[PDB]
Amino acid sequence: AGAKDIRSKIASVQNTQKITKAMEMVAASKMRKSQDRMAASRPYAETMRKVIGHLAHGNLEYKHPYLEDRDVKRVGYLVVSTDRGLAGGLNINLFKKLLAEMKTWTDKGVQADLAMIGSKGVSFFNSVGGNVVAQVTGMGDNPSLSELIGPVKVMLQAYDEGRLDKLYIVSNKFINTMSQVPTISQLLPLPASDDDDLKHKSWDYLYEPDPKALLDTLLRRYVESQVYQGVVENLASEQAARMVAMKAATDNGGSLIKELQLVYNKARQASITQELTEIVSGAA
Amino acid sequence: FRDEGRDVLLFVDNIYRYTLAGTEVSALLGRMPSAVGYQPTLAEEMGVLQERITSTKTGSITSVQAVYVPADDLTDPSPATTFAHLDATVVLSRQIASLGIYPAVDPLDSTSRQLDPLVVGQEHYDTARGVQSILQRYQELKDIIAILGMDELSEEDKLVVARARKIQRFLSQPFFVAEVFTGSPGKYVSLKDTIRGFKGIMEGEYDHLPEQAFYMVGSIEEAVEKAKKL
Amino acid sequence: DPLVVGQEHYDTARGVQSILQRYQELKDIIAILGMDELSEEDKLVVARARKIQRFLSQPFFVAEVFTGSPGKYVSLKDTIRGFKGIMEGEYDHLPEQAFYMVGSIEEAVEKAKKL
Amino acid sequence: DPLVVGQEHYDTARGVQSILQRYQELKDIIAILGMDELSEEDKLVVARARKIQRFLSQPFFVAEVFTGSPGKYVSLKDTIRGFKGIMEGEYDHLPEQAFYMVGSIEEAVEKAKKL
Amino acid sequence: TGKTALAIDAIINQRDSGIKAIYVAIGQKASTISNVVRKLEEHGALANTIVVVATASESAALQYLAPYAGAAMGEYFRDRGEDALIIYDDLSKQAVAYRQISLLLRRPPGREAFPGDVFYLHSRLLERAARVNAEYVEAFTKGEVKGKTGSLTALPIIETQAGDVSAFVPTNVISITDGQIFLETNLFNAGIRPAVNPGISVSRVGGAAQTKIMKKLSGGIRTALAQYRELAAFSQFASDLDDATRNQLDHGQKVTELLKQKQYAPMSVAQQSLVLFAAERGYLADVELSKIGSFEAALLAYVDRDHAPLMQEINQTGGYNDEIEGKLKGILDSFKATQ
Amino acid sequence: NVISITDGQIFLETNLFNAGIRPAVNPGISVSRVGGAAQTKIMKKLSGGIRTALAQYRELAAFSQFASDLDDATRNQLDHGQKVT
Amino acid sequence: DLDLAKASATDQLKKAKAEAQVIIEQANKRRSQILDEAKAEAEQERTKIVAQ
Amino acid sequence: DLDLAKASATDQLKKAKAEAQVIIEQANKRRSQILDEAKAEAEQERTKIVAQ
Ligand SMILES: Nc1ncnc2c1ncn2[C@@H]1O[C@H](COP(=O)(O)OP(=O)(O)OP(=O)(O)O)[C@@H](O)[C@H]1O
Ligand SMILES: [Mg+2]
C-alpha cells in the first residue's frame, strides 16, 4: 500500500469516470443527429428498391448483367467500420460474421474481394489476410455519398468487367435505441420479389431514350443509394454502442473508487496506529 | 423530567466532541491509546452515555444526536462505535433544499430499523417500501431522461414519473417557525393521515391533481382544498 | 533449474509464469474498459491464461467429502504435456469450464464433449 | 517578480508553468482513452508541451563523463528568447529531439537542420 | 500558494477603515519578515498595524506564546469599542513549538506526539475573537463610550502537507473556526492567483457579513461557477452541444478569468461591485476573449475619468436600488463605446 | 539508509522476473555514479546509447498502448527497445 | 431609389467622420490625463522618499 | 453603393478607433519612462543626503 500513491490513483480514477460520463453525453447527441439523417435517407432508398422490385417481374423485358442470376466464381463485400475505438465490439462482431461467410465460400473454392469504408476494417483485414481491393477512411461526423462513390466505382468495374459475379454489403442494423445486429445482404444481382407483371399504367417511357443506357444509369443509382443508407445506419449504430460502452466504463470506475477508498482508509488507520505505538513504546 | 412521567427529547450538539474530549482527558491522565489513537475505554464511555437514554415503565428519553464522521471514513472507530447505538438515521441534503422542499430530508438515505412490518404494521411498512422503490426508480429515469429525452418513455413510465413528482412534493411541510419565512400557518400531520395520503398517491387516487397542490399543503385533505382553489 | 529438473519442465513452468503475469497486467485495463479494447493477441493470451488457471485445479481424494467428485492422481509427464499443449494453442477449441476440476488433459477433452 | 526580473521574463515563466500543468492532467486521459480522442487544439497543446519539456534539458561540463558529450552554458536572455519562441509557435514545425540536450534556440535550429 | 500574500493584503486594505490590524509572524525567517515590513510601509500604512515577530531562532516558549500576546493586544481594542483584525501566520508552527515544550517536560504524548490539550491550545486561542455587544463594552469601558460595539476578526493560517486535510492540527483548527479560505496548489501553479477554490471554501456566517450591493451582485457568481465546474470537464472533448450549455460553459470560463488580480492591488467596494455587475448583467458576454484584464483596467480608468460621483456614493453607502441599477447600466453602456 | 550510502543501485523486481526478464534489472531506477569511468573504452562507447534507449523506450511503451497506427520514428524506437530488452 | 441611396450614404459618411472626431478627442483627453497624473504621482513618490 | 457606404462607414469607425489606440499605447510607454526617471532621481538623492 502507501497513502500518497493510493490517493493519487483515487484522483486519477475519479477524473477518468467524470470524463467517461462526458463522452457519453457527446455520444448521445451524435446519435440524435445520425438518426434524423437516417430518417431522411430511408424514403429514397425504400422507393428505389420498390422500383427495381417491380422491374423484377415486368413484361416486354430485356437482359442486363446486374439482373440475371449468374454463377459465382468470386464474391465481393462492401464493409463498413468505424475509424475509432471505445465503441464496444460492434466492428469485431461484424468482422467475425463476414469471416464466417467468407470461410463458407472458401470451402467451395470461391474467392472474396473486399472493399472497406473504415480504418478498423482496413487494419483488421490487412493483418488477417483478406484481399482488400478498395478502401476509404476518415469520412467524418457528417458522411457524404460523394467520397464513398469511389470504392463503389471500383467494385462496379470489377463486376462489369466480368470478374466479380456476386456482391454483398455488410452493416449493422439500427434495430432500436439500445439494440443492433450485424447483417450480410445481397446487393448487386437482383434479389427475389413476390409479384407478376403489371400490364399497363400511363406511358412506357422506356423507348423514348435508349432502354439499355437508362437502365444502366438507374441501377447505378440503386446500388449507390443502398450503400449510402447502409453507411448512415452503421454510424447510428456506432453512436449507440459507444454510449453503452461509456456507461459501463463509468460504473466500473465508480466500483474501483469504492474499493480503493477502503484500501486507503485501512492504510491510514494502520499507519497512524504503528506510528503512535512507536511513540508510546519509545517513551520507555 | 423522565421521572416526572414525561417523554423527553435530548439534543446532543455533537457526540463526536464528547468522544474526542474523552480522548483528550485520557491522554492527560497518561493512559495508553488504542486503535487509531483513541482512549482505551472508548466503548465503555459511549455505552455509559447511551445506555441511560431508554424508555422506562414510566417516562422516556428520546434523543437526536448530531454525528460527524472523521475523514469521511465510515469504518473509523468513532463512527463505527456510534452506529452500534443509533436506531434511526436522518440525512439532510443541500440538493433537496435547493428545490425548495423543506424539511430537506433525503428519503433514500434516511433509514430506521423500526421500519419492519411486525414493528410498525404491515400497511405502513408496505407503503414505505412502495414510496422508497418508486422514488428510486424515478432517480434512475431522471438520468435516462437527461441523457436521451422524454420521447423515449412509455405511458407506464410517464405515469411513474408523474406520481414520483407528486410524492416528492407531498413530502414537504410548512412549519410554525416557517410562518415567518413563508407566511404559511404551519401544520401537524398525524401518522395515519400521512400514511393515508401516500397510500392514495401510490394507488392512483389524486392522479388528477396538479403537482403544486401537494407543496407545503400539510395533509392530503388540504391538498384537495388547494387544488379546489387552484 | 534445468540442470536438475530438465529443460522441458523448466520451459513449461516459465511459460506458465509469463502468460499469467501478462494476464495480471491486462486485468487492470479490462477492469475499466472491458475486453473489447484489447489487441487480438492480448485476447488470445487472456483466453489461454484463464484456461491455464482452470487447469491448475485438481480434485483430491481427501477432499471428496466437501465436493463429491472422485479424486485424481496426476503424473509429472501428464501435467507438463497438458500445460505444453495449452501454451502452444493445441486446445484453443475447448471451452474454459472443461478444464475445471479435471485430472489429465484427456479428461478435459471428455468433459468438453458433454460440456 | 515582474518588478524584480524583466516583465517579459515573468510572463514567460508563468506561461511555461501553465502549459506543463495542463499537460499533466491530460496524461492519464490520453493514456487510457487514446490520443485521437483529443481536439485539434488539444493536440497542438500536447505537441508544444512535449517540445517545451524537452527544451528544459541541458548537458553540463561536469556531467560530461557520464554521457559523452560537451557541456553547454546558456545566457538568461537566450533562454527567455527560446522559450518565448517555442510558446509563440515559431518552432512548432521542429521535431521533439531538435530541442533535446541543446543550448540556445539557434543551436536548436542548427540541430534541426542536421536532423 | 499565497497565504502570506492574502493576509498582508487584507492588512493593507485596512489602511482607511477604523479597523486596526495585527500581523503575527510565527517561525518566519527573519529576512522574509523584513521584506514584508518594507512592503507594508511601502504599499500603504504600517502605522495601523502591530507586528509581532518570533523568528525560527528564538526559544520555543516565545514562539508558543507569541499569538497569545498578539491576542492580548487585539483584545485591548476589542473591549475599547473599536474593531480590529489579527492574522496568525502558520498556526501549525505554534503547534510545533508547543509539541517541543510538552515533550521536553515529559508530558504524555498523543496522536502525532502532540500533547493531549493541543485542541485546548488553539480553541482557547481562537475563541477570544468575537463581536461584542454595547452593554459589555460600555460596562468594560466604564461608560467612556455608550453605544458602540467592538470586535476582533481573526484570520489564522495553516499549512497542509501535500494537501492532507485529515491531519490532527488542521482538523482541530477546522473544527474550531467558522469558514475557511482553501487555497489549492494546482490552481496557483496554473497562474490563477489568488487560487481560492469554490465548493470546498465556505463562510459559515453567510451573507449577513456582506454589504447590500456586494450581496446582490454576488449571488449568481456562485451558481455560474458551480455550473462551470461540472460542464468544463465535458468542455475539453465536446462540440455540437446545446447552446444553453455552450453559453453556460463559456460564461463560467470568463467569470473564472475575471476573479484574479495582481498581488498588491486592493479593490474598493464600488470597483468590485461594478466589475461583478458587468459580469452578471452580461456586458462581458460579447467580450469573452483574452482581453478581459485589459477590459477591466480600461473600464476602471474610464469610470474614474468621468463617473466618480457614483463611486463615492457606493463606497460610502454600499447600497443598491433601482436608480443605482440604472446608473450602473448607463456607465457600462457608455464604456462599451470606448476602448 | 543503505540506498543513501552506496555509489549506485541495481534493482531486481518480481514483475520483471515473472515476465521472463532475467536478470530482472530495471533501468531508470538503477544507476552507477562512477558511470562511464568504470568501463573499458569500447564498453563505455557502446553502453552510452543503451542507457537512454531503454529508459525512453518504457515511456513510449506506456504512452502508446492503444494507438493502433503510429509514427514510424516512435515505431523504430519501440521496436528497438523491444530488441534491446 | 438611387437618390435615396446617395442621401443615406452621405449621411453615414458624415456620421463616421463625427464619430472619428469624438473618438480621437477622447484619445487626446486620455493622453493629457496620463501625462499629468504621471507627473503628480512622480512628485508624490519623490516627496515620500525624502521624508523617509 | 449602399453596401459600399456601409462598409466604408464601418471601416472608418475602426480606423479612427485604432488611431486612438496608438495614442493610448504611446501614453502608457511615456508614463513608464517618466516614472522610472523620477524614481531614479529620488533614490539617488536619498542615498547622498543620508550619507552626508
Ligand atoms: N495574485 C498573485 N499574483 C502573482 N504572484 C502572486 C500572487 N499571489 C501570490 N503570489 C506569489 O506567490 C508566492 C508565494 O506567496 P506567499 O508567500 O503569500 O505564499 P504561501 O502559501 O503563504 O507560502 P509559504 O507557506 O511558503 O510562506 C510569492 O512569490 C508571491 O509573489
Ligand atoms: Mg507565504
UniProtKB/TrEMBL annotation, chain A:
Listed GO biological process terms: proton motive force-driven plasma membrane ATP synthesis
SUPFAM superfamilies named among the record's database cross-references: ATP synthase (F1-ATPase), gamma subunit
One family name in Pfam for this protein: ATP-synt
Cell membrane found in the keyword field: yes
Residues annotated as transmembrane: none
Protein keywords: ATP synthesis, Cell membrane, CF(1), Hydrogen ion transport, Hydrolase, Ion transport, Membrane, Transport
GO terms, molecular function: ATP binding; hydrolase activity; proton-transporting ATP synthase activity, rotational mechanism
InterPro entries, alphabetized: ATP_synth_F1_ATPase_gsu (IPR035968), ATP_synth_F1_gsu (IPR000131), ATP_synth_F1_gsu_CS (IPR023632)
Major subcellular site: membrane
CDD domains membership: F1-ATPase_gamma (cd12151)
Entry's localization field: Cell inner membrane; Cell membrane
GO CC, alphabetical: plasma membrane; proton-transporting ATP synthase complex
Entry membrane topology: Peripheral membrane protein
Domain of life: Bacteria
Record function comment: Produces ATP from ADP in the presence of a proton gradient across the membrane. The gamma chain is believed to be important in regulating ATPase activity and the flow of protons through the CF(0) complex.
Family per record: Belongs to the ATPase gamma chain family.
Subunit structure, as described in the record: F-type ATPases have 2 components, CF(1) - the catalytic core - and CF(0) - the membrane proton channel. CF(1) has five subunits: alpha(3), beta(3), gamma(1), delta(1), epsilon(1). CF(0) has three main subunits: a, b and c.
Name of this chain's protein: ATP synthase gamma chain
Annotated organism of origin: Escherichia coli
Organismal lineage: Bacteria, Pseudomonadati, Pseudomonadota, Gammaproteobacteria, Enterobacterales
Chain's gene name: atpG
From TrEMBL, chains C, D:
Cellular compartments annotated: Cell membrane; Membrane
Functional description taken from the UniProt entry: Produces ATP from ADP in the presence of a proton gradient across the membrane. The catalytic sites are hosted primarily by the beta subunits.
Entry similarity comment: Belongs to the ATPase alpha/beta chains family. T3SS ATPase subfamily.
Protein name as catalogued: ATP synthase subunit beta
UniProt organism field: Escherichia coli O25b:H4
First-to-last residue of the parent protein present: 346 to 460 of 460
